[PDB]
């Protein structure tokens, strides 16, 4: 390798990062074979991390060789794949998996080291679903240590040097507790991923009306910095518009459309996020 | 040392019959008897 592949969270904060290398250090639980191991000092009194997957095992799905989440968005791989509608055929059984890994490394040897191989580019339409489920700031709780089992029973007699966060241990009844690393990599029943599914299912999106002839769309929360041509340029080449009523006595709008699916495109993509000159409009189908 | 495994043609000893006959390079012997370590171990555990 040249260096690891991991997100900013796993990657660190200080401008000068310190990581030690060992060639052929241990076994990628994916490629199953020896890899290089680079070990990075995450943060002040924060657990030193290490590279935990073959670089090819990484370029396969385009995820973090330490943080394990995708490198573009940073959600569970099950999620990110489905958010691209992506459907990978990676084999599972022992002999099948070894044959797959061998030919995979052969096929990746013909690469230039810039981007993951295969459908990872022909699924690069990062949907606003993924964009919105994407975390914003570095959830740097990751580099805090374990539960110092001594310090959970009382025993951690080393003073403050408990090797692990001497807090209350999580009740493993939580589905967010035991996610086998191999399953999390295979996209195999990640309960955290199902939580992201429930969250991105309950997260607000624009609603559909009943009758097809309701082609009037009310956009609530306009303000008096908007123009009718600006409401147009928001919803104009996204189809054809038939008319628009910019209600200044109520600070809203209403686009009567010329294509129903065009209306759907503009409005559903616009739900609360059509931010032209900074005003939170609400795209709905009018009365 | 203690020369540990005596040479007890086990086909003979258990079934009274060795297929090799005269050439069996072991000892034709059907005698059950406490060994060179059985007794040591039982007594010390006693």
């Amino acid at each position: 390798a040249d260096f690891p592949i991991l997100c900013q969270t796993c990657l660190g904060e200080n401008p000068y990062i310190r990581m030690t290398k060992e060639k052929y250090g241990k076994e990628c639980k994916i490629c199953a074979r020896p890899f290089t191991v680079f070990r990075w000092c995450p943060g002040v009194r924060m657990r030193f991390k290490k590279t935990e997957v073959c670089q090819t095992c990484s370029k396969l799905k385009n995820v973090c060789q330490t943080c394990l989440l995708d490198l573009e968005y940073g959600l569970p791989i099950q999620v990110r794949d489905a958010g691209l509608s992506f459907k990978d055929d990676m084999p599972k059984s022992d002999v099948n998996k070894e044959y797959y890994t061998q030919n995979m490394e052969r096929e990746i040897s013909n690469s230039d080291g810039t981007r993951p191989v295969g459908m990872l580019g022909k699924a690069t339409s990062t949907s606003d679903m993924l964009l919105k489920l994407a975390r914003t700031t570095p959830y740097y709780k990751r580099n805090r240590p374990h539960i110092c089992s001594f310090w959970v029973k009382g025993e951690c007699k080393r003073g403050e040097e408990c090797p692990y966060r001497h807090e209350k241990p999580t009740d493993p009844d939580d589905p967010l507790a035991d996610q086998n690393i191999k399953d999390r990599y295979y996209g195999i029943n990640d309960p955290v991923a199902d939580k992201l599914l429930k969250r991105a299912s309950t997260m607000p999106r624009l609603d559909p009306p009943e009758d097809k002839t309701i082609t009037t769309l009310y956009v609530g929360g306009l303000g008096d910095t908007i123009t009718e041509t600006d409401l147009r340029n928001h919803f104009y080449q996204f189809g054809e518009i038939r008319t628009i009523t910019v209600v200044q006595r109520q600070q809203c709008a209403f686009i009567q459309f010329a294509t129903r699916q065009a209306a759907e495109v503009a409005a559903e993509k616009s739900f609360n996020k059509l931010i032209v000159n900074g005003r939170r409009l609400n795209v709905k189908w009018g009365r | 040392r203690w020369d540990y495994q005596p040479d007890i043609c086990k086909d003979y000893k258990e079934t009274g019959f060795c297929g090799f006959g005269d050439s069996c390079k072991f000892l034709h012997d059907r005698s059950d008897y406490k060994h060179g370590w059985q007794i040591e171990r039982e007594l010390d555990e006693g």
């Binding site: 310190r18 030690t20 009194r45 007699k157 080393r158 003073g159 403050e160 040097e161 | -």
Partner: protein, 143 residues
């Protein structure tokens, strides 16, 4: 029963007043040596030994240099008989290294990046006061 004496030559004549201190330090080195690792083994297993060693050789460091209560030739005998630590002492004699805990705490090769233990950095530069445990000695900011 003591560290049986090899040279066969008679110890010079300040030995008799460090006598019981040396004897006792040896006895408790023996006891802290045979001491069982009930959570005091592993990383902290030798935490006690260097303690006793540095202890003894500091004692002799005083009693020859800071008091001059002892003869040169006696103290020579008492290094050559393995109580003291001639190299630890020849460093202790330095300007910033008065309390260097274990002579391995400045071994630059003993560490991957080519430094010393944080056991050597003076605490004022740290400003974080987080308890510092140099793994080797366990020591607490020798400097």
């Amino acid at each position: 029963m003591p560290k049986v004496k090899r040279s066969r030559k008679a110890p010079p004549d300040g030995w008799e007043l460090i006598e019981p201190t040396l004897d006792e330090l040896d006895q408790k080195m023996r006891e802290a040596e045979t001491e069982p690792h009930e959570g005091k083994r592993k990383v902290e297993s030798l935490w006690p030994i260097f303690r006793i060693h540095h202890q003894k050789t500091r004692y002799i460091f005083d009693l020859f240099y800071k008091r001059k209560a002892i003869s040169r030739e006696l103290y020579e005998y008492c290094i050559k008989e393995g109580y003291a630590d001639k190299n630890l002492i020849a460093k202790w004699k330095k300007q910033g290294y008065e309390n260097l805990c274990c002579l391995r705490c400045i071994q630059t090769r003993d560490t991957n990046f080519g430094t010393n233990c944080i056991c050597r950095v003076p605490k004022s530069k740290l400003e974080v006061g987080r308890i510092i445990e140099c793994t080797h000695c366990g020591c607490r900011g020798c400097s």
